[PDB]
Design a protein around this ligand. Structure first.
Ligand SMILES: [Zn+2]
Lengths: 1318, 716
């Protein structure tokens, strides 16, 4: 089954893998982020309540006065979308926060608060998200992208190779809180551990460990194990555990009970260890020398003296052994230190310590934070405590705490926010183990180590910053907390949070002015991810590796979508099926696989989760069951792929399309083309521009539908039914009664978006695409937007194409186009220019807007109005005045069209600073918009009343139905008609209060919008009124313009040329476009050829259909041919029939197809070559597809017949007139007498220093001198050059450019005798 | 005021902006000539406002300047005549943003063209390395007549045809016209116009355009050449030559001086490059310019005639690819099982696996190349014959228009083995090929590789720019100031052999350089050339046929110029024929030339092949016990004195190497004399006698370690 609308134009498809799951909602991530952000969800949990309870409760210290928070709410925004755009303000709604303030008595903490109060106080205003996930900050549309940042937690890195040029691999650890100070631990080539905070000066690690109030003996106990020697009357017999023997050499005869177990010098084999274990030999006799090398652990004291027999962490010898022996301490404890197993890093780390008392370590910390201040005991103590053990300046989020526990092999996922001593202890334990081999570094580029945020996250963080600021203010004012004479609006301040949020949205590396020129552009930009921004690695210093893609991005980040040149691999886009894990990571779908059945269900997996498992490859052969017919099948387990058994995977890729992102999912025949040009094209798809007409891209991919429906450029049908009124202005839908709700039934009105400004100065507009009284389905197109075609994305246009060298006109990529292509203007594009003028008040009077201007031709004034403003619809040109502005003195400063650009005025918007009058045209426009708004309100009220009264009539079909009485009286009183005692009468009564509400709401909305239009909208200070004007320019095509297809096939256009010079086939049809064959081999893509043959075949089918339509070939033959066309070969997904089709639909669909047969093709599950050959056989076209062509100029066949077909070219947004720019004599810069630059200001080309070197390379001397001197200064040189050139002379007096004199006399001012010489 | 970026030196002596300057995207307009360029009419209008005003007041159309400004901005009728008049003779500079080498700025004559894009001559784009992707080139205009003289005389394309880095013509045709010319000088065995005779090329073109004959077919045609063997005198001879129809048609475009053998080949990119080289080296400059212009035009026209296309069927996948891949899969499975059996290690397993995969890929490459090159098998007018193939892809590759063997290998066959981001080659190659579909994984890995390449290219671009900056700023000072230092001292130049084939010959290294000492041929007591003379191509070829191996030549480092360099020390100024001229600085061009390819850069025993006598250098040897010759000198090197007498082969001999022969003896070509054991340092003895333990203390200095294999131990 298929929708009526979808049945309008069924797109042919090729594909074998069934669509187990559809394309999800593409714009999901932004909606998820914001809806999670804004909601009255209980228990916080990543919501505004979370921030509130983080900042609340609040009270001045021991003030017995607590401000507590009740609830938060958001009323409707002051405006809606369209009027907000027109006005230019933020699209935002307030934040009404119920706060409860309660104050106790003295010595009554637990006692009842003596006074209570609560109020819905005002706290700032927040912007709202658009239905398309966007925002409006000031009459402008922007997108907040998410940044792929590092996951908070703990990580470990090697830093090998070039480090110290010693070949000694280092090992570093970094604990990175979600919010708090950084922390890093670093070894050195001397095998000494160290620590630094915030990349500050290096310090020993253990210094902070003893600063954690742990004794040296305690520290060594934590980081070592005890080895015991007993004074058994001589020789200090040792307790031996076999596990402390591996990888060692016995310097003595290890023996016991009179039996030798290891001879002196014999290394301890595993056999010796087993001998000891089976014999169970623990106590042995060791020589004194073996104990000399050992290091004492603790501090011993003699009984008589009590003095230090030996300091902790000290090597032993016979003298110390005797000194402790006289005391008689039978217990001699050392620590098991091995070069291989337990390097004694802690020992010398302690020996390097400056001091021993925790106070000195705290003093060192305090000095290190802010060097050059006195060390204070209590300030240092509080500093250390709150630096890592206080929410104020340190915390770990759930994600941070979760991954911290996870890395530490722990069992609990949720824990404290601040650190604990054991946390650092165990992190150091892991570090030393990695130093010893167990464990490993964490590959940072791996996504599970990374993390992605979403708009709510940063927005809530800014809210928290503002919250703490206002909390500081509140505590300050509450330090003077008086006795209930104030309410909590003296406590509060509106500026802070609103300022923070609006500033962040305005200026930020994450809030970017959206790229709004094409549905694909905006959807891709929203589905974008970056590594930049706060906590984001800088563009210039970014590592080459992070640029490089890591294997785990499979399915999670499209390798093929990222802009090239200034940066690469930092702004990788979002994969299609990728969703966001609950913990800010990237969940990806998969198909569960049982013992032998590929479970079609979906199961989501995380990054690290994939590594543990092994997953079946996408293009896997299965037979009616999911049963992998091949016992050997390629699958990937841990960053690598190889052939595995039939039953070893429990998961299976969801679809071929998963591998790429939306920006790449639309490239047909990607599998046959190199990644380089693929990426280049995929970027180029972003910058495409719509033409006047859509062209239903022939070689579709099936993704056009999903992007179309999700991209809200079109008028989607919220519900099914029929359209009752169709117009360019709007559409009226009577929803089906079952679809229609019983109460509030009414009918829907869809408002089309008209011709209006883009974000690239292009045009954007919606047009209806459905006839009157036409069935319509829910969730479906009603009116296409730009570059959308019956709800399918039509970016560029498909044209007849050929590959051959044509008189060298296509040398590098210089595309060739016939005058036919421009003749029907199918490439033509529209652009909008919004020129603005302001009326500020200066000294010596304000800036007037009068028509009267001194010394201006009446012709310039002729196109203007009485006030001095142009009439809409004027075919203005570069130079003419638009609004007559004069600076009192009086002098002329009237706005004009930019030089060299024509156009036609489409509209003038006028806003006035509140408190100044309006001219005749401004008042007229105000009245016109008033009339338009009143008209809109009246017509919507009238049609809604008509629907309501028709519902009344339907109700009165029964219940005292009256025919002559009903139509006799007018619609004023239809309830007076008879009806028995039924709910219908009450239902009719309900409709009567609905009518009264319609009246009163209409009145109130009328008054409100009347005031809103009439009132002067707030403007920046100084301005009295601002006037914008919109100029339309219809730019068609010219040589130098840039266009390309869907294979990265970049190409500028050489020369529009006659139809008659072009080659043409035997039947005479010429080729619209000709491209260079040599792009194929070097630029390693061939899919253009395949799709070209495909489009040729599809167009041949369409031509046959059109021929049999022109001839009366009634649906029977057409039905048979279409049936033949749609089945067409191997296993497919269409599986459609024509027996079900409604001959009306047959002819309508044939008409839709008379211009071509749209073909769908997944990324890799597309058609095969023979299938293309199969379609060609269905067509009349040659199986090879290389057709003989005939030259227009010579008039005969070209030997070696030529590949020709159909290609979907796209018009890029680089029009030659835009890039065109020059200058001869304009304005000089203020700071220096040099030409300006750029196009917006009439500048000149920039001569670089490498161009200087090249000039120096040539012997040309005068050229360089004059170019840098008179073409960029000397008064005599430039004046005399003007005289020569106007006189006809071409000659220069080089002289000397006075800047040399400036430098010379500047030096002379200094005590420097510098001078010329003979 | 003096320091910092705002300091006057760094403020206003640096890359500035320039008035009377323009910019736009560029196009071809091939019908134009290399001595001339296109320019959109509007740009001409705004650029030359003062010039047009001067001509206007000269004609008195509007005396005051303001009225003239009004007339021109109105775009009145007479102004275009004035524009043509001023553009009658007024060249201008065309430039590109990444100005790496000096041809990136160049002088040309504008022609007024409609539209909105600049037509640029095809070939010079290659010098500009500026594809037509949308590159926006800029334009400047000289003002003083001296600057016009400089541009027309120095920055003129006619005066800029050869590279400064070296003498190859930078005007070599790039990709398309080369296809047409390759299409010319290639034979089909049997077609129209095969098997007759013609009196000249004119009727050859007549018959071709008639369609009565094929574009190419072996046919005897009378042709005439004009040779300058005499003392600058033409001698016109004529004779029949077998040739292809297209080849004879091409012969007309050749100037008089050149012979026909040069055109009688397949005309590859290198072949045509040396064609231009000969044309310039024999006939000077203007004939080269005209010849190149006509080459452009005719090749474009006949490439259009060609209908050179490309299609899916035009690529062929040999069936043996299936079989070869099957064999490779079986072999890798066998080796993996062997590893499972424990015979081999994982590292060795992987190494052998990649080796066999590479060998299978080489087999596939050979199979497809054979399938491609000679696929044309057809009747000869008889039964059957196989000739070079006329498939478009092989024509493209063999012509050298674009690509190489590797890319066509990727197109038809497997695209080899990809590495990982760590750079280690991956065990599993790309079994599939582009013509067939590529699985998810192969495309994924290829994307890893390609993105690595792209990021590396960006980094390499930045680093090359910075390094070039360094090279220019270090060498800004040096300039030629004297003709001759009068020094007798110079470097010695010889061919270069790394230990294999000679990599750069003597002709290239010595060309255009003034000898420091005269050349002494081995007709000893022969002053083959004077002592202080320049060596150009004729002299270099004289030396080459004379078999001169080492030549002492002047060098700049040996120059005794005070505060400068002597011209004779520098020799030829490449990009020009004559010796370097006085005053012309060379440090900047040298640095710029060496830096230009900075973008193009990247970020046991011996079997003697040649036959010759044996010579040794740093020789100190002895006959071993077995009678073979071993070397007692670490720095020894073996030369194979060829039959003529020159050292065609040189190899570094390690210590104590095994030699089946000795010095001053003859070795057959392909005889193993160079062999040795690279591991372990020998203690070979100079003399013979009893080996006493002189100063050997056992147990304190040395230790007695016993071998567990044989029993005969050795002191350690
Ligand atoms: Zn010298």
């Amino acid at each position: 089954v298929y929708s009526y609308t979808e049945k309008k134009r069924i797109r042919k498809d090729f594909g074998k893998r069934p669509q187990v799951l559809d394309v999800p909602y593409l714009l999901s991530i932004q909606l998820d982020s914001f809806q999670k952000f804004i909601e009255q969800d209980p228990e916080g949990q990543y919501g505004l309540e979370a921030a509130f309870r983080s900042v609340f409760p609040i009270q001045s210290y021991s003030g017995n006065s607590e401000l507590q928070y009740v609830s938060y709410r958001l009323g409707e925004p002051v405006f809606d979308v369209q009027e907000c755009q027109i006005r230019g303000v933020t699209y935002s709604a307030p934040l009404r926060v119920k706060l409860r303030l309660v104050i106790y008595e003295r010595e009554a903490p637990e006692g009842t608060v003596k006074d209570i109060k609560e109020q819905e106080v005002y706290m700032g205003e927040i912007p709202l998200m658009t239905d398309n996930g966007t925002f409006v900050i000031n009459g402008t549309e922007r997108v907040i992208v998410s940044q792929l940042h590092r996951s908070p937690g703990v990580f470990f890195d090697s830093d090998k190779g070039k480090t110290h040029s010693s070949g000694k691999v280092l090992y570093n650890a970094r604990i990175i809180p979600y919010r708090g100070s950084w922390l890093d631990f670093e070894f050195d080539p001397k095998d000494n551990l160290f620590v630094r905070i915030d990349r500050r000066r290096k310090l020993p690690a253990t210094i902070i460990l003893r600063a954690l109030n742990y004794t040296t003996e305690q520290i060594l106990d934590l980081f070592f194990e005890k080895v015991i020697f007993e004074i058994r009357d001589n020789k200090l017999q040792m307790e031996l555990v076999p596990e402390r023997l591996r990888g060692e050499t016995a310097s003595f005869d290890i023996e016991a009970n009179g039996k030798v177990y290891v001879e002196k010098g014999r290394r301890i084999t595993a056999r010796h260890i087993r001998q000891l274990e089976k014999d169970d030999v623990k106590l042995i006799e060791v020589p004194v020398e073996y104990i000399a090398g050992k290091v004492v652990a603790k501090d011993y004291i003699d009984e008589s003296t009590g003095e230090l027999i030996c300091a902790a962490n000290m090597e032993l010898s016979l003298d110390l052994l005797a000194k402790l022996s006289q005391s008689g301490h039978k217990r001699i404890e050392t620590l098991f230190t091995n070069d291989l197993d337990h390097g004694p890093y802690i020992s010398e780390t302690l020996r390097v310590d400056p001091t021993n008392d925790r106070l000195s370590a705290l003093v060192e910390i305090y000095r290190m934070m802010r060097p050059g201040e006195p060390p204070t005991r209590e300030a240092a103590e509080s500093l250390f405590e709150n630096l890592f053990f206080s929410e104020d300046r340190y915390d770990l989020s759930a994600v941070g705490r979760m991954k911290f526990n996870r890395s530490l092999l722990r069992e609990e996922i949720e824990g404290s926010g601040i650190l604990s001593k054991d946390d650092i202890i165990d992190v150091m334990k892991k570090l030393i183990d990695i130093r010893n081999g167990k464990g490993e570094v964490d590959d940072i580029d791996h996504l599970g180590n990374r993390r992605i945020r979403s708009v709510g996250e940063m927005a809530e963080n800014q809210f928290r910053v503002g919250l703490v600021r206002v909390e500081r203010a509140v505590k300050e004012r509450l330090s003077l907390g008086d006795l209930d004479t104030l309410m909590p609006q003296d406590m509060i301040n509106a500026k802070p949070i609103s300022a923070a949020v609006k500033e962040f949205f305005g200026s930020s590396q994450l809030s970017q002015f959206m790229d709004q020129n094409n549905p694909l552009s905006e959807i891709t930009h929203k589905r974008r991810i970056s590594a930049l921004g706060p906590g984001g690695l800088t563009r210039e210093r970014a590592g080459f590796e992070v640029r490089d893609v890591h294997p785990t991005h499979y399915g999670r980040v499209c390798p093929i979508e990222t802009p090239e040149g200034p940066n690469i691999g930092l702004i990788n886009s979002l994969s299609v099926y990728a969703q966001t894990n609950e913990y800010g990571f990237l969940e990806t779908p998969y198909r569960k696989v049982t013992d032998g059945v590929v479970t079609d269900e979906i199961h989501y997996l995380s990054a690290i989760e994939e590594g543990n498992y092994v997953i079946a490859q996408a293009n896997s052969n299965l037979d009616e069951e999911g049963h992998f017919v091949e016992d050997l099948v390629t699958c990937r387990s841990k960053g690598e792929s190889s052939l595995f058994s039939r039953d070893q995977v429990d998961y299976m890729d969801v679809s071929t399309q998963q591998v790429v992102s939306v920006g790449a999912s639309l490239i047909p025949f990607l599998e046959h083309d190199d990644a380089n040009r693929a990426l280049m094209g995929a970027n180029m798809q972003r910058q495409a521009v719509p033409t006047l007409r859509a062209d239903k891209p022939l070689v579709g991919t099936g993704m056009e539908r999903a992007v179309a429906v999700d991209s809200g450029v079109t008028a989607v049908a919220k519900r099914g039914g029929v359209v009752q009124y169709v117009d360019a202005s709007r559409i009226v839908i009577k929803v089906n009664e079952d679809e229609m709700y019983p109460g509030e039934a009414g009918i829907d009105i869809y408002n089309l978006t008209k011709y209006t400004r883009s974000n690239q100065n292009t045009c954007i507009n919606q047009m209806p695409c459905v006839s009157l009284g036409e069935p319509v389905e829910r969730g479906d197109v009603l009116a296409d937007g730009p570059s959308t075609d019956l709800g399918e994305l039509a970016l560029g246009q498909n044209m007849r194409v050929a590959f051959m060298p044509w008189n060298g006109y296509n040398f590098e990529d210089s595309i060739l186009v016939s005058e036919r292509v421009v003749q029907e203007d199918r490439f033509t594009t529209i652009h909008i220019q919004e020129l603005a003028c302001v009326s500020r008040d200066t000294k010596l009077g304000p800036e007037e807007i009068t028509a009267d201007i001194p010394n201006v031709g009446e012709a310039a004034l002729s196109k203007l109005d009485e006030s001095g403003i142009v009439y809409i619809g004027a075919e203005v040109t570069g130079g003419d005045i638009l609004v007559g502005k004069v600076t009192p003195k009086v002098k002329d400063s009237s706005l004009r069209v930019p030089n060299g650009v024509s156009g036609t005025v489409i509209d003038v918007q006028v806003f006035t600073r509140d408190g100044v009058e309006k001219d005749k045209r401004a008042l007229e426009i105000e009245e016109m918009q008033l009339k338009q708004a009143k008209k809109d309100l009246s017509e919507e009220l009238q049609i809604l009343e008509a629907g309501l009264f028709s519902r009344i009539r339907a109700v009165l079909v029964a219940g005292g139905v009256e025919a002559e009485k009903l139509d006799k009286l007018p619609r004023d009183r239809w309830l007076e008609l008879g009806l028995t005692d039924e709910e219908k009468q009450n239902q009719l009564e309900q409709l009567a209060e609905q009518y009264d509400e319609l009246k009163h709401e209409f009145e109130k909305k009328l008054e409100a919008k009347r005031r809103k239009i009439t009132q002067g909208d707030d403007l920046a200070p100084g301005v009295l009124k601002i006037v914008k004007v919109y100029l339309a320019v219809k730019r068609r095509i010219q040589p130098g313009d840039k266009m390309a297809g869907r294979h990265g096939n970049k190409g500028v256009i050489s020369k529009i040329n006659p139809i008659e010079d072009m080659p043409y086939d035997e039947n005479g049809t010429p080729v619209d476009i000709v491209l260079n064959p040599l792009g194929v081999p070097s630029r390693m893509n061939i899919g253009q050829i395949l799709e070209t043959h495909l489009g040729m075949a599809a167009k041949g089918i369409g031509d046959k259909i059109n021929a049999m339509l022109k001839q009366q070939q009634e649906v029977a033959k057409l039905r048979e041919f279409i049936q033949r066309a749609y089945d067409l070969g191997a296993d497919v997904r269409q599986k459609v029939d024509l027996s079900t089709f409604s001959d009306e639909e047959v002819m309508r669909l044939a008409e839709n197809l008379r211009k071509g047969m749209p073909i769908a093709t997944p990324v890799f599950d597309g058609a095969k070559e023979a299938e293309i050959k199969e379609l060609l056989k269905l067509g009349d076209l040659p199986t090879s597809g290389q057709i003989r062509l005939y030259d227009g100029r010579t008039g005969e066949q070209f030997e070696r017949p030529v590949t020709v077909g159909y290609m979907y070219m796209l018009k890029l947004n680089h029009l030659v007139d835009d890039k065109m720019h020059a200058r001869s004599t304009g304005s000089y810069s203020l700071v220096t007498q040099q030409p300006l630059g750029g196009k917006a200001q009439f500048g000149g080309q920039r001569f670089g220093e490498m161009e200087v070197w090249a000039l120096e390379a040539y012997g040309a001397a005068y050229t360089l001198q004059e170019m840098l001197t008179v073409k960029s200064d000397d008064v005599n040189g430039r004046t005399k050059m003007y005289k020569n050139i106007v006189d006809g002379n071409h000659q220069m007096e080089p002289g000397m450019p006075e800047s040399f004199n400036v430098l010379l006399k500047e030096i002379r001012s200094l005590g420097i005798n510098i001078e010329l010489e003979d | 005021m003096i320091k910092g970026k705002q300091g006057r030196f760094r403020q206003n002596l640096l890359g500035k902006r320039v008035d009377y300057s323009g910019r736009s995207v560029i196009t071809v307009g091939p019908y134009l000539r290399l001595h001339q360029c296109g320019l959109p009419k509007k740009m001409a209008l705004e650029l030359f406002k003062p010039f047009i005003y001067g001509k206007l007041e000269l004609r008195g159309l509007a005396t005051t300047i303001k009225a003239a400004k009004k007339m021109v901005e109105r775009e009145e009728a007479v102004v275009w005549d004035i524009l043509d008049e001023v553009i009658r003779e007024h060249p201008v500079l065309l430039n590109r943003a990444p100005t790496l080498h000096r041809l990136g700025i160049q002088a040309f004559e504008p022609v007024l063209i409609e539209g909105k894009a600049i037509q640029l001559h095809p070939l010079v784009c290659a010098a500009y390395n500026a594809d037509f992707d949308g590159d926006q080139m800029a334009v400047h205009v000289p003002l003083t007549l001296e600057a016009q003289l400089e541009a027309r005389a120095l920055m003129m394309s006619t005066n800029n045809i050869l590279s400064p880095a070296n003498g190859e013509p930078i005007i070599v045709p790039s990709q398309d016209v080369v296809l047409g010319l390759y299409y010319m000088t290639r034979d089909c065995v049997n077609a129209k116009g095969e098997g007759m005779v013609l009196t000249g090329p004119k009727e050859a073109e007549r018959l071709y355009r008639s369609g009565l004959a094929s574009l190419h077919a072996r046919v005897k045609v009378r042709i005439t050449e004009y040779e300058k063997d005499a003392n600058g005198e033409l001698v016109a001879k004529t004779s029949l030559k077998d040739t292809t129809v297209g080849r004879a048609i091409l012969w007309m475009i050749v100037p008089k001086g050149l012979p026909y053998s040069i055109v009688n080949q397949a005309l590859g990119k290198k072949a045509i490059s040396k064609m231009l080289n000969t044309c310039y080296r024999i006939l000077g400059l203007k004939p080269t310019v005209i010849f190149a212009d006509q080459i452009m035009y005719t090749g474009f026209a006949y490439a259009a005639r060609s209908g050179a296309s490309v299609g899916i069927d035009d690529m062929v996948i040999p069936e043996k690819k299936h079989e070869i891949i099957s064999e490779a899969e079986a072999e890798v499975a066998e080796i993996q099982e062997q590893f499972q059996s424990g015979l081999v290690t994982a590292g060795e397993r992987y190494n052998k696996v990649i080796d066999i995969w590479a060998a299978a890929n080489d087999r596939v490459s050979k199979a497809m190349m054979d399938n491609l090159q000679t696929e044309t098998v057809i009747n000869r007018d008889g039964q059957e014959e196989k000739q070079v193939s006329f498939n478009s892809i092989y024509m493209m590759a063999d012509s050298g228009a674009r690509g190489s063997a590797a890319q066509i290998r990727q197109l038809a066959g497997m695209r080899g083995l990809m590495a990982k981001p760590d750079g280690s080659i991956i065990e599993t190659p790309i079994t599939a090929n582009f013509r067939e579909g590529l699985n998810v994984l192969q495309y994924f890995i290829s994307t890893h590789g390609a993105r690595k390449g792209l990021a590396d290219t960006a980094l390499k671009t930045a680093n090359s720019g910075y390094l070039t900056r360094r090279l220019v700023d270090v060498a800004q000072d040096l300039v030629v100031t004297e003709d001759d230092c009068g020094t007798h001292e110079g470097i010695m130049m010889t061919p270069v052999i790394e230990g294999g084939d000679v990599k750069e010959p003597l002709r290239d290294r010595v060309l255009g350089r003034v000898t420091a000492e005269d050349v002494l041929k081995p007709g000893t007591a022969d002053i083959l050339v004077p002592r202080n003379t320049l060596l150009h191509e004729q002299w270099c070829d004289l030396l080459e046929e004379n078999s001169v191996d080492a030549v002492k030549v002047r060098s700049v480092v040996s120059c005794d110029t005070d505060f400068g360099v002597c011209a004779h020390c520098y020799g030829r100024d490449l990009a020009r024929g004559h010796i370097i001229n006085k005053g012309e600085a060379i440090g900047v061009i040298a640095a710029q030339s060496i830096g230009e390819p900075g973008t193009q850069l990247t970020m046991s025993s011996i079997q003697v092949k040649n036959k010759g006598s044996i010579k040794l250098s740093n020789v100190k040897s002895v006959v071993n016990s077995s009678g073979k010759l071993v070397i007692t000198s670490r720095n020894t090197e073996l030369k194979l004195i060829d039959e003529f007498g020159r050292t065609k082969e040189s190899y570094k001999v390690p210590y104590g190497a095994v030699l089946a022969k000795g010095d001053g003896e003859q070795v057959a070509g392909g005889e193993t004399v160079a062999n040795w054991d690279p591991h372990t340092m020998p203690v070979i003895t100079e003399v013979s006698g009893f080996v006493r333990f002189t100063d050997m203390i056992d147990g304190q200095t040395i230790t007695r370690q016993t071998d567990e294999l044989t029993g005969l131990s050795s002191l350690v």
